[PDB]
């Protein structure tokens, strides 16, 4: 009759799964892990980077029950995927927890399928909170844990001692492809906010504050006579912005978010970079040491792999009223170079079907005929492009 995690892991471990995807870029196959979010729908969450380039996705339950799963979406900017179990029967969903209650020194239990072994459990502690700055592109607000995590723990669960989900295990810092006691996992509230949009829309509505800024270090704090040594410094506020409306001027230091202390700009970025458009939030800031509060909501951001499910070179921009499948970004040497078209101009006329909206593509783009025929209007002229 000794202390043990076993009674808690009796119920929670079924909610952890293992995923095995096959696909193309080739040929390759790789493995990860997943967490059942909605039991009755078959909603598994995982890491976007284990889901990229996915033809067929087969979850495996803890009891050995195999299944199939189609994507519900992806979020390459936070490395959170979400998938839908095909014909799901008698699943168990894991309870969430509020990441805003995590403190350094609390206990954590890591669950996944590391090394294709099976459902492996490890324990640890919260090594630190709000670690980021491993890749500039992605919104990260990671949790550091000493709980052993290795290849295949992808999109796994990390949980407190009541079996309540706190994190989705994402990456390890390990020079030699083996855990040396550092593990990173996306918090729950972030995963909760992103998945929530991924159910209704199959995409994430990016809402912006309209502020520029940079990390406040203790040497800039000497410059501006600000009594905060970490925080978010304000470079400039954009016009007609939700922040500019609120009364945010250049030269303010954001110190809190909804009353919660702020670990960095990278966390402030990643935290509200995930919240859906029009989310109410409070910020605490420091203008000449007079600690001013203000409230605001997010507005729309304004200014391929979303549909292709395999090639992320191009970027399907907004349709438009009449237009459609406009694109505003592409890289030279991508899978969007074998195709023929370029970023500078694009529309639609696929397979002799009068089509314009990204939704009207997929009703034929899912038909998968033997040969595809694009019909952009590059420049003022008409052209065509063939495929498959």
């Amino acid at each position: 009759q000794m202390p043990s995690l076993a009674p808690m892991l009796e119920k929670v471990m079924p909610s952890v799964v293992s995923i095995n995807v096959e696909g193309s870029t080739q040929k390759f196959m790789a493995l990860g892990s997943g967490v059942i979010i909605d039991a009755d729908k078959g909603y598994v969450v995982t890491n976007n980077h284990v889901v990229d380039n996915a033809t067929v996705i087969k979850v495996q339950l803890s009891d050995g029950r195999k299944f199939d799963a189609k994507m519900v979406g992806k979020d390459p900017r936070s490395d959170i995927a979400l998938i839908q179990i095909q014909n799901p029967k008698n699943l168990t969903a894991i309870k969430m927890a509020d990441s805003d209650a995590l403190r350094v020194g609390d206990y954590t239990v890591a669950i996944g399928n590391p090394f294709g072994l099976g459902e492996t459990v490890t324990s640890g502690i919260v090594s630190a909170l709000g670690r980021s700055g491993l890749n500039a592109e992605n919104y990260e607000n990671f949790i550091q844990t000493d709980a052993a995590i290795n290849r295949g723990n992808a999109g796994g669960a990390l949980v407190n001692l009541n079996g309540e989900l706190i994190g989705i295990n994402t990456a390890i810092l390990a020079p030699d492809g083996g855990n040396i006691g550092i593990g990173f996992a996306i918090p729950s509230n972030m995963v909760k906010n992103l998945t929530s949009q991924m159910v209704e829309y199959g995409q994430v509505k990016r809402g912006e504050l309209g502020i520029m800024g940079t990390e406040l270090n203790s040497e800039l704090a000497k410059a501006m006579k600000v009594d905060a040594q970490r925080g978010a410094f304000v470079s400039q506020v954009l016009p007609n912005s939700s922040a500019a409306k609120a009364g945010i001027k250049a030269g303010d230091v954001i110190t809190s978010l909804n009353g919660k202390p702020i670990s960095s700009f990278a966390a402030l970025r990643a935290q509200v970079g995930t919240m859906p458009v029009g989310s109410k939030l409070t910020l605490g800031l420091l203008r000449d040491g007079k600690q001013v509060n203000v409230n605001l909501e997010l507005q729309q951001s304004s200014q391929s792999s979303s549909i292709f499910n395999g090639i992320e070179g191009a970027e399907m921009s907004n349709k438009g009223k009449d237009q459609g499948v406009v694109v505003n970004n592409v890289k030279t040497g991508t899978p969007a170079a074998q195709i023929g078209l370029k970023k500078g101009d694009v529309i639609i006329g696929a397979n002799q079907q009068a089509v314009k909206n990204i939704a009207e593509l997929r009703k034929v783009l899912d038909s998968k005929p033997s040969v595809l025929a694009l019909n952009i209007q590059r420049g003022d002229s008409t052209i065509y492009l063939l495929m498959q």
Binding site: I211, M212, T214, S235, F265, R269
Partner: peptide, 5 residues
Amino acid sequence: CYRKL
């Protein structure tokens, strides 16, 4: 560098 939220 300089990033924008």
